[PDB]
Amino acid sequence: PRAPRTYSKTYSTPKRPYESSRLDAELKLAGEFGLKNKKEIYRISFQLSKIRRAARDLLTRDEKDPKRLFEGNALIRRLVRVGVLSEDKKKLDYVLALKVEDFLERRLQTQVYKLGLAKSVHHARVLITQRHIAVGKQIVNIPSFMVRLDSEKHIDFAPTSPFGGARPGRVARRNAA
Amino acid sequence: ARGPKKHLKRLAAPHHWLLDKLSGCYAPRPSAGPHKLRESLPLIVFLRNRLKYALNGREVKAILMQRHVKVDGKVRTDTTYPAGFMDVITLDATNENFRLVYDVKGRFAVHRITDEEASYKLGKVKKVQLGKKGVPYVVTHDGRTIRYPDPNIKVNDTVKIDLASGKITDFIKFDAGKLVYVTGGRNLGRIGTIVHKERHDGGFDLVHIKDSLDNTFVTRLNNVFVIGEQGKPYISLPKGKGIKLSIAEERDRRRAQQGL
Amino acid sequence: SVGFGLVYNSVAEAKKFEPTYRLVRYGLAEKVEKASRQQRKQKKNRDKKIFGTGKRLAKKVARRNAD
Amino acid sequence: AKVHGSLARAGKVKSQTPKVEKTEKPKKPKGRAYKRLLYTRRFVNVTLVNGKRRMNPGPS
Amino acid sequence: GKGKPRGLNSARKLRVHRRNNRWAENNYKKRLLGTAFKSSPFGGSSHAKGIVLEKLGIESKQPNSAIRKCVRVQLIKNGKKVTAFVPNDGCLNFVDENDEVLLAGFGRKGKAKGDIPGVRFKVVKVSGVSLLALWKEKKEKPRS
RNA sequence: GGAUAGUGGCCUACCAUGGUUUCAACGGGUAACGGGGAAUAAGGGUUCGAUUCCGGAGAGGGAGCCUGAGAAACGGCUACCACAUCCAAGGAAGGCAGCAGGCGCGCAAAUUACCCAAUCCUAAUUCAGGGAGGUAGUGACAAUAAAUAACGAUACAGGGCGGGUCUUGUAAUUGGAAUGAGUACAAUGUAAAUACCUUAACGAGGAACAAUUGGAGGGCAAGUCUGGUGCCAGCAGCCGCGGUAAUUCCAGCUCCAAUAGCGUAUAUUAAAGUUGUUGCAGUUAAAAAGCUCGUAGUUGAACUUUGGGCCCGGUUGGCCG
RNA sequence: GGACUUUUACUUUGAAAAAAUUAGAGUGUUCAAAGCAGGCGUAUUGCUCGAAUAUAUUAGCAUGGAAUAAUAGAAUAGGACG
RNA sequence: GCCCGUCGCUAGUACCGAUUGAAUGGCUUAGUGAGGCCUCAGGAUCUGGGA
Ligand SMILES: [Mg+2]
Ligand SMILES: [Mg+2]
Ligand SMILES: [Mg+2]
Ligand SMILES: [Mg+2]
Ligand SMILES: [Mg+2]
Ligand SMILES: [Mg+2]
Ligand SMILES: [Mg+2]
Ligand SMILES: [Mg+2]
Ligand SMILES: [Mg+2]
Ligand SMILES: [Mg+2]
Ligand SMILES: [Mg+2]
Ligand SMILES: [Mg+2]
Ligand SMILES: [Mg+2]
Ligand SMILES: [Mg+2]
Ligand SMILES: [Mg+2]
Ligand SMILES: [Mg+2]
Ligand SMILES: [Mg+2]
Ligand SMILES: [Mg+2]
Ligand SMILES: [Mg+2]
Ligand SMILES: [Mg+2]
Ligand SMILES: [Mg+2]
Ligand SMILES: [Mg+2]
Ligand SMILES: [Mg+2]
Ligand SMILES: [Mg+2]
Ligand SMILES: [Mg+2]
Ligand SMILES: [Mg+2]
Ligand SMILES: [Mg+2]
Ligand SMILES: [Mg+2]
Ligand SMILES: [Mg+2]
Ligand SMILES: [Mg+2]
Ligand SMILES: [Mg+2]
Ligand SMILES: [Mg+2]
Ligand SMILES: [Mg+2]
Ligand SMILES: [Mg+2]
Ligand SMILES: [Mg+2]
Ligand SMILES: [Mg+2]
Ligand SMILES: [Mg+2]
Ligand SMILES: [Mg+2]
Ligand SMILES: [Mg+2]
């Protein structure tokens, strides 16, 4: 009777499970952008392989086939609108080539670091969670925002966060009492 | 299976009613009436979903029981009444009137119309034959029988309906070059006015249509609804007059209205 | 905090078109209660097993004080 | 072949290992904090290059 | 052409010839004949709980020489009798014959595993509790 | 002709001898309801669909029927079979493959709770009714997001270019910061509650708010560390380990993998070009009938208006804009 | 309207075409799985975009093509046009 | 060196086998036949030929 609540998975999994070449490599990415799960990496490989064998499929169509452009130009719009594809690259032969790290450097937990304002890449992840920084009045506690380079302009802290103008905060207030 | 089904699950509901899946389990099963079940729309969705006058279903019943609503003239208090294409819904409060007319996306659109226009009607005649005592009658897409029409009305033609009373006065004909309205398939919504009609004795005569953008298409004759003369209709078409904007056409103009 | 509300062209129109669980939220209609739904269902069934008044079977149950 | 060999020695050596107790350690960090330390531990001060490097050298 | 008919109209021959020749695949006949249910004392199920009749100790196959501690079990859904290994150091002391035990395959598609000659099942739980959770003294065996 | 709502061997009477089949009839099997669909990602495929939607069938097993617009209805009746309850022994009553709950079966699956507020449905009908349906509880089925920490100062030390002033940081005293897990005025939420969202008051330093699960000879990532055992006990999907210095067992230590999850069993798909149409193999590894005929099936040489001419206007892109 | 038409296979395009599923556009659910919303002012009594597209493919229908592969035609002329 | 078969031990599997062996389901002859339905009667009554 119920209508079926749709779901899906967000992470693939390496077939060879112990390729230490790719396993060190995986961790360098992990301990760089501040990730907890190697499946935060496996996750963002997944969409990439989707974008690719979405995109790779379009360059088979006869050049400028009706739908190849509609969702072609729909695709490259989506990725510059988050700023992973750079503005030179909006004719979609180069979207096949989005090496993974581009996606990670466009996180929230990442740019909150590259804007200064994160002493470490992990001071980032720790304050995002804790009622700290926002974009509008809209607090965000998801270190995987994928900020869209438009709203990257306003990433100052929140008004209720006692690091960007607030009341003292919970344990300060009786360190002083 | 032991007689009449009287329930309608969701996702059995007609898509063009645009109900969200999770609001329960069921759509409102339209009642029996003028319009085919799958080819109609009930009052409770009109007053609740597309037009958002009422919040819940319980309210829609409260609304109708005050004789507020009229369709084609009459009080018509059936919460699930099968109101269909080309009906008129006068609304006593607000002095609003709506003719029921498709988009070119094929759904039922909200379309306010004049008080003058709110008192005539058309119908694709679906049958014509003699009857009791030999008085001929026409019957049309909407479920009414007009006794004593002219011998010149054959079948497949539209008819003006006074609907303060019964009779017809004018009857547009089905010939090469009359304004048509596709009322099925999903060329549903597109418009205009002939190319020609392939006979195909045995069934399923094919109707060729040329929209007023020099774009052809074909649909079956059962689903072509002549509505008059080139560019000269006999009712008020809705916005964009059904000329099947492309996906890129539609989103090029989608971003044409770009600056606030 | 976004929401949704309505104002009425009178307060008799409010009290008559409004769901009555709201006039309880306000103090504008009284809370007065009913027995839990399952209890009265049973009374129905208990009542289905009687044909008529129910007055005139009291007659003959007090009439086996002899028998 | 034979299927009715003895059963006295069931659990013979687990019974008789001198069962040294566990020894208390500091509390290790978790998914980000921990895999951070490996990024450092693996990649910021190389263990050794005397030949090539070992991730668990006991006596070397 | 060395073999198979290539004409555009030989589809039936191609289909029946595969249909027929697929019978040489052992996974394919095992699934079609149905040996899972007819043979294979588990009901084709993932596990089956039984009752232990005797505690045996089985001479290991060569070139090994041990005594593998196992139990003869009578599958309670089937009446079938099956010998099954009790793995870990000890874990014979937990089984307490006439006890109720839960049995699993060996991850060898039947085809008994190791040096233990002809046993294709292992205990997972005696007295319905979590055998390893008794080896590691997480839990206690119930009263009976 | 009869019967049907009506067609019809549906049934009857008469007459005839037809109907299907290797292009697989007929029979058997099915751990078989069909489908929309699900799983598996080069493709071609392979496997699965009791199960939210559509269709069908059934209400313990049959058959029969009343009512009716509609039923061969079972929360209708009647009979038989099986099951089975109450009794004053005369008799009477029961049909959960509805909701919940119980026994049984098993590897295997939750409350005898709340409401018509929503979604819809039915009635004589805005009102009544609705275990349809929705609410909570139970709930590592699956699915998403992602806490268990974050910045210092210092101190021996490295290394930048004697430690100086740039931190690599390894530090076993420190340090003021931050916060929800929890708790809880309150409002919100709700039919009434509950959670969540929001938010006073509380609420973190190792005694914690203390992450697991497997594994560390090979495949396969991580030690020929230490103690134990001595072909014993045990490990080991496979190759193989243990018979007294065990890289493999039982442990302590250290280490790796995944991580609110991870192991095991069973099935299944990929890998599998080991089912091969794409795409296999058949001298000797598995596999050309001893031989020829030969029906079905599959297959089957070539040659029939080609070539030339006039026109129309379409769609890219060029030089121009 | 009349008269009369050798039979096919193949390929094109198109109609007929349920939703949910899938592929996929739009939309910043705080993110995401989702959902089909939402977005704007004069936030004093309204303004407004939506709810795409794709997908069926075996069979049937409709239509364009005449290569490829079949069937049939005048030989006891019982042929063809009148 | 390798290696074959009878013979003997332990264990497991499946086969053959007196028991005109057993069991579970699906049909089904013959025999008996419930019930409701259709129908020939019936006529407690209850009425204007009907019930
Ligand atoms: Mg209705
Ligand atoms: Mg009630
Ligand atoms: Mg009553
Ligand atoms: Mg063979
Ligand atoms: Mg034995
Ligand atoms: Mg059984
Ligand atoms: Mg006949
Ligand atoms: Mg015969
Ligand atoms: Mg065959
Ligand atoms: Mg079945
Ligand atoms: Mg496929
Ligand atoms: Mg396969
Ligand atoms: Mg199904
Ligand atoms: Mg199936
Ligand atoms: Mg079943
Ligand atoms: Mg029945
Ligand atoms: Mg029942
Ligand atoms: Mg029923
Ligand atoms: Mg008595
Ligand atoms: Mg139940
Ligand atoms: Mg379970
Ligand atoms: Mg319920
Ligand atoms: Mg329920
Ligand atoms: Mg914890
Ligand atoms: Mg602490
Ligand atoms: Mg461990
Ligand atoms: Mg290694
Ligand atoms: Mg070996
Ligand atoms: Mg060890
Ligand atoms: Mg795994
Ligand atoms: Mg091919
Ligand atoms: Mg081969
Ligand atoms: Mg040989
Ligand atoms: Mg030969
Ligand atoms: Mg032969
Ligand atoms: Mg040829
Ligand atoms: Mg098409
Ligand atoms: Mg006998
Ligand atoms: Mg009769």
Query: How far, in Å, CA of B48 to CA of B23, rounded?
Result: 13
CA of B3 to the centre of ligand 39 (A): 30
CA–CA separation, B90 vs B79, rounded Å? 16
Give the nearest nucleotide to A9, CA to C1': F143
Count of other CB atoms within 10 angstroms of residue B233: 16
SS3 B54: coil
Whole-number distance in Å between B65 CA and F113 C1': 37
Residue-wise DSSP of chain A: --------------SSS--HHHHHHHHHHHHHHT-S-HHHHHHHHHHHHHHHHHHHHHTTSSTT-HHHHHHHHHHHHHHHTTTSS-GGGTTSSSGGG--THHHHTTSHHHHHHHTB--SSHHHHHHHHHTT--BSSS-B---TT----SSTTS-----SSSTTSSSS--TTHHHH--
Q: Which helix (H) or strand (E) holds E20?
A: helix E11-21
Contact A83, A106 (CB under 8 A): yes
Name all domains of chain B by residue range, CATH numbers in brackets: 1-116 (3.10.290.10), 121-171 (2.40.50.740), 174-244 (2.30.30.30)
Nucleic acid strand F within 7 Å of D30 CB = yes
Q: How far is CA B147 from the centre of its chain?
A: 23
CB contacts under 8 A, A 100-159 vs D, are 122, 125
The Å distance, Cα E78 to ligand 38 centre, comes to: 28
The DSSP secondary structure of D5-52, one letter per residue, reads ---TTTTHHHHHS--PPP---PPP--HHHHHHHHHHHHHTS----SSS
Q: Check A24 against D43: CB less than 8 A apart.
A: yes
* Token pair in block for residue A122: 């992990």
Q: Do chains D and E touch (3 or more CB pairs under 8 A)?
A: yes
CA torsion angle for A44, A45, A51, A57 (degrees, to 10)? -170
How far does chain D reach from its first CA to its final CA, in angstroms?
Answer: 48
* CA–C1' nearest nucleotide, residue E56: H11
Joined tokens for residue B36: 């085919």
- Residue B70 · residue B119 · CB < 8 Å: no
| CB proximity B7–strand G (7 Å threshold) | no
* CA end-to-end distance (rounded Å), chain A: 59
Q: Which ligand is nearest to the CA of B2?
A: 18
Q: Which residue has the tokens 């139990």?
A: E71
Residue reference for tokens 């699934």: E31
Distance E28 CA to ligand 35 centre (A): 29
CA angle E100, E106, E112 (to 5 degrees): 105
> C34 CA distance to ligand 17 centroid (A)?
29
Within 8 A of C13 by CB-CB distance, chain B residues are: none
Nearest CA in chain B to A73: B248
For residue D33, list chain A residues with Cβ-Cβ distance below 8 A: 122
Report DSSP letters for E91-126, one per residue. -STTT-SS-EEEEE--SSSSS--SSSTT---EEEEE
Closest-lying nucleotide for E58 based on CA to C1': H11
Q: Confirm if A40 and A32 have CB atoms less than 8 A apart.
A: no
Task: Check residues 212 to 251 of chain B and report those whose beta carbon is under 7 Å from nucleic acid strand G.
Answer: 217-220, 223, 239, 247, 250-251
First to last CA, chain E: 72
- Interface contact flag, D40 A31, Cβ < 8 Å: yes
Q: Do chains E and C touch (3 or more CB pairs under 8 A)?
A: no
Sign of CA dihedral E115, E116, E119, E125: negative
Provide, in whole angstroms, the distance separating residue B16's CA from nucleotide G26's C1': 18
E92 interaction partners in chain D (CB closer than 8 Å)? 7, 10-11
- With contact defined as beta carbons under 8 Å apart, do B112 and B64 qualify? no
Count of pairs with CB atoms under 8 A, one residue in A, one in B: 13
- Ligand 28: centre distance to CA E118 (Å): 15
Q: In angstroms, rounded to a whole number, what is the distance separating the alpha carbons of residues B148 and B133?
A: 12
Show the DSSP H helices in chain B as ranges.
43-45, 57-64, 247-254
CA–CA distances in Å: residue E63 to residues A153, E59, E116: 73, 11, 12
d(CA B11, CA C9): 38
Interface partners of chain A (CB pairs < 8 Å, 3 or more) are B, D
Please, how many CA atoms are within 13 Å of residue E41, restricted to the half-sphere of its CB? 21
| CA of A7 vs chain B CAs: smallest distance (Å) | 15
Tell me, in Å, the resolution of the deposited structure: 2.9
Tell me which method was used to determine the 3D structure: X-ray
- Each domain of chain E, given as residue ranges in start order, spans 1-144
Enumerate the residues of chain D whose CB falls inside 8 A of the CB of residue E52.
Answer: none
The two structure tokens encoding residue B108: 């039922």
Task: Kindly state whether B62 is in contact with chain C, defined as any CB-CB distance less than 8 angstroms.
Answer: yes
Chains contacting C (3 or more CB pairs within 8 Å)? B
Q: Please tell me the distance from the alpha carbon of residue A71 to that of residue B248, in angstroms, as a whole number.
A: 10
Q: Which of residues 35-64 of A touch strand G (CB under 7 A)?
A: 50, 54
Residue of E nearest to D1 (CA): E59
Domain boundaries, chain A: 17-177
Residue B55: CB partners within 8 Å, gap ≥ 6? B48
C44 CA → ligand 22 middle, Å: 19
Give the C-alpha separation, C42 to B48, whole Å.
37
Query: Which residue, B35, B221, B43, B42, is CA-closest to B143?
Result: B35
Say whether the CB atom of B201 is under 7 angstroms from strand G. Answer: no
Q: Contact, A133 vs A155, CB < 8 A?
A: yes
Distances (CA, A) of A19 to A45, B51, E31: 16, 60, 36
Identity of the residue in B22, B25, B247 whose CB atom sits nearest the CB atom of A70? B247
Contact assessment for residue B46 and residue B37, using Cβ atoms and an 8 Å cutoff:
no
> Chains with 3 or more CB pairs closer than 8 angstroms to B?
A, C
Helices (H) and strands (E) in chain E, counts: 4, 6
Best E53, E65, E69, E136 member to test D by mutation, with max D CBs in 10 Å, is: E69
Query: Rounded to whole angstroms, how far apart are CA atoms E81 and E90?
Result: 23
CA distance B46 to B53: 9
Q: Integer distance in angstroms from CA D29 to C1' F206?
A: 12
